[PDB]
Design a protein around this ligand. Structure first.
Ligand SMILES: CC(C)(COP(=O)(O)OP(=O)(O)OC[C@H]1O[C@@H](n2cnc3c(N)ncnc32)[C@H](O)[C@@H]1OP(=O)(O)O)[C@@H](O)C(=O)NCCC(=O)NCCSC(=O)CCC(=O)O
Ligand SMILES: Cc1ncc(COP(=O)(O)O)c(C=O)c1O
Ligand SMILES: Cc1ncc(COP(=O)(O)O)c(C=O)c1O
Ligand SMILES: [Mg+2]
Lengths: 468, 480
């Protein structure tokens, strides 16, 4: 009689096993007193973590931990409500104010996660403008893909960073048609970067809104870690600090960061906590707040988790040493790999993707690294990346000092030898792949700045609704 | 002249202001050292919180706070990754095991929130069964509505708890058609309860899966706070404790909790933290884990927040005093309101919805209560509730002792007088509404009976206290 629900689930699972995309999770317990070590199942088995997105190691920062401990003593664990009922509070007000200050926007709105933030904003735009056309970069994150599907409007996918194709799509609509350009600043799987300035120019010309996911950039780019949008006018922002610059880096009236309509970020990476946000105009923020179901009808994040994020954001804002440090640690690993002929996918960012080119060998490498060498690096396979371009993702932080880097370099070299993995010159002979075998965002001048080169002012209503 | 984006936003906002559904938030800072007080903008301005969903006051429980503090010292703040990469850990394994133990299911899966959990599970069911027909209760939560929309399949909305209409809809399809019945155990806006047993019977007959949101029940119903599904076989579960009962409360083979395919809950109410989950079979859990994008592609919750929830769950499991206490505090307020003719929407649960019937007057009441009387109660308006049925939501907890209750009762009475709000007799004269002033309405008896309310922690099975809860292979993936 009845539909065979068990059989459908059995064979859907078995499909994932045969194509070998069935994932086994790793028991990884990060130690706050011993960054970036972690223990496995037993506390005795420790490993060095080289694939975390705790990019600035702020998850274990004293000011973050102190903020949590002190906030727990006063507020407890849960918020005990939503923003509409019993879950609106000062830690929330401070976190939203910080995020708005960071991107120098009129307002910011916090959600459970950036996944939720992206889904909420993209959903709402498409639901309230049925005529909207969304232009989405090929390599956008799952959350943006889902948000665009949920938007339920027309969409065009442009080839990765191909702004010719973007302009061709934009041009084919009248100017009066509402449009959204949705893209990331830094793409995490090989560390490519968007030309935000040129996209804003396109948006001005064809009358589009811009939606920029800076998830892999906040903390990391710009003098204050406000992202690649800030970095685009690095000197203007560094000179003005907290304040809006009088001009951009070309003497024009508005910065790239000012011109982007909507910037989303996470609290769960550089900022060492959990949560997501969008920063935008007062009007946009009030709009999302008043209509987004994924904002309204869910428990507010714990006060302590917000306090933690807020401290992480305040601290990194005026500690450019975090960024120069991380950039230097990255360059150090990249350069060492280059000398050993360990194939790194070239990129101008903080990520170190090591090309393997085979799913099995990458998984096998991952395993030997953790079991033989106590190095935790994750293998990236289909469908995150194209089949044949599988890789190890390595993400250095300020805490990966050169001693730790040396151990990694030696370990990776050993594994390449053990499994007879291709070196750079083996890729060269096959015509190259993704840059391997055939210009950093951080310049030398920028990398030699210290905290003394920041503006003193970076040291020390829409969130609630507006009356009418 | 491109599209006027600012003007569209301006007029969409202005629409919310004129219909008076534009919400202003209140700055409410809950004090863990003085439950259930909170301060406003200034620490000096304190108020009593009467509308929190921290139903058992476990947000400030010593075992919860200790678990957080100790977990932070070891793990830090963020998990620093997703479940696939660097964000799988022991606090996660323990939390999922506890949730599976609570609902006596083979597995459980933790998400950012129950909103996400609902959206993920409903989305996936409809995406992998395009032929699915979903039968959804009228009053389902926004998260379930969104999840059903995203499921992108056929749906029928049956009138609230009308299982005649449900059966009529179910009947009109062949048995072989895949079907889902999606409903809540306790509905939060007037505290109604579903006949879960009869819905499971319907599901057996017409070949449907059941999806049960127990968000407003976990912590509160059943001997161990496993929800209304547990309460349905209260004695069977109480006798067996942690273990699966040999029989249900009618001597039959399977409990109501066993028969429900998928149960979702929150960690953000009774369990005093944040997060969501689904409990179900090993196969269903592994399925969601392997395919749900809202599970896969997001940072894992902080270890400390999971540890907190886990402690909250372990503690309440063997502390039925939390439930009897709360039930008694609720009954006390309800009975006092009944004597003063303050119109409470009758219900067999822990919620105390005070009927006002006008959006402005409910907001006005809310304001006088907090400013004049230092009582924080929230007004519920359209679209959360039907226009003309606006109300104040009051949710007592074990911490709302009778002294606090007395002050509330007096305050609400004073405000009813100040604004000349309708009393029960005034509703009687308008024919009644939702049970208030409706002669020959026969109330559903409270879920908690006298016999159940007089149980103590000594009446629970010893095996629910400090149980060794083994971790689950399905939380990590299954070898074979
Ligand atoms: C297995 C596939 C091919 C996906 O599976 P399928 O082929 O079954 O899916 P599909 O045909 O794409 O159907 C799913 C829907 O995704 C949509 N879709 C795909 N790419 C899109 C984009 N950039 N913007 C908007 N929508 C997009 C398709 O149009 C389709 O919508 P319709 O149904 O309306 O046609 C995988 O390789 C994949 O991930 N493809 C998406 C493109 C990609 O490279 N994504 C980056 C993943 S990496 C990640 O998450 C990290 C990214 C980062 O941090 O930068
Ligand atoms: C019945 C019901 N389910 C789910 C939710 C959402 O759960 P969470 O707060 O865990 O996102 C709520 C919140 O209002 C609810 O009332
Ligand atoms: C580019 C990008 N956007 C969005 C997200 C989602 O952020 P969250 O972890 O806060 O849900 C991620 C997560 O990895 C991401 O990499
Ligand atoms: Mg206020």
């Amino acid at each position: 009689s009845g539909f065979d629900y068990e059989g459908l689930i059995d064979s859907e699972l078995q499909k994932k096993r045969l194509d070998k995309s069935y994932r086994y999770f790793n028991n990884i317990n990060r130690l706050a007193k011993e960054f970036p070590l972690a223990h496995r199942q037993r506390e005795a088995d420790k490993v060095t973590v080289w694939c975390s997105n705790d990019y600035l190691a702020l998850s274990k920062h004293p000011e973050v931990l102190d903020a949590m401990h002190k906030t727990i003593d006063k507020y407890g664990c849960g918020a005990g409500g939503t923003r509409n009922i019993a879950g609106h509070n000062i830690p929330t007000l401070n976190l939203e104010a910080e995020l708005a200050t960071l991107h120098k926007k009129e307002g910011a709105l916090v959600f459970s996660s950036c996944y939720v933030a992206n889904d909420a904003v993209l959903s709402l735009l498409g639901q309230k403008m049925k005529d909207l056309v969304i232009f989405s970069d090929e390599l956008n994150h799952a959350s943006m893909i889902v948000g665009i599907k949920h938007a339920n409007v027309k969409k065009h996918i442009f080839k990765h960073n191909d702004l010719n194709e973007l302009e061709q799509l934009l041009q084919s609509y009248p100017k009066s048609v509402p449009k959204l350009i949705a893209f990331e600043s830094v793409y995490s799987m090989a560390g490519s970067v968007a030309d935000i300035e040129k996209i804003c120019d396109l948006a001005d010309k064809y009358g589009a809104l811009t939606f920029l996911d800076e998830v892999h950039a906040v903390g990391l780019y710009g003098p204050h870690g406000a992202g690649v949008a800030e970095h685009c006018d690095f000197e203007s922002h560094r000179a003005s600090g907290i304040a809006t610059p009088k001009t951009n880096d070309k003497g024009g009236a508005k910065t790239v960061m000012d011109r982007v309509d909507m910037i989303t970020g996470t609290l769960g990476k550089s900022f060492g906590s959990v949560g997501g946000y969008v920063a935008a105009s007062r009007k946009l923020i009030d709009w999302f707040r008043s209509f987004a179901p994924g904002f309204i009808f869910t428990t507010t994040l714990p006060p302590s988790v917000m306090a933690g994020a807020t401290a992480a954001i305040r601290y990194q804002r005026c500690h450019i040493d975090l960024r120069t440090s991380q950039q230097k640690h990255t360059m150090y690993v990249k350069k060492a790999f280059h000398e050993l002929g360990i194939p790194v996918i070239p990129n101008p960012s903080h990520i170190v993707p090591v090309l393997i080119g085979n799913a099995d060998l990458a998984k096998q490498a991952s395993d030997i690294l953790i079991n033989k060498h106590q190095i935790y690096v994750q293998a990236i396979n289909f469908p995150t990346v194209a089949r044949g371009t599988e890789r190890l993702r390595i993400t250095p932080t300020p805490g990966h000092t050169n001693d730790l880097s040396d151990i990694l370099i030696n370990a990776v070299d050993d594994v390449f030898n053990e499994l007879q993995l291709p070196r750079v010159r083996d890729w060269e002979s096959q015509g190259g792949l993704l840059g391997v075998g055939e210009s950093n965002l951080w310049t030398s001048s920028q990398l030699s700045l210290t905290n003394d080169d920041l503006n003193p002012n970076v040291r020390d209503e829409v969130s609630s609704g507006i009356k009418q």
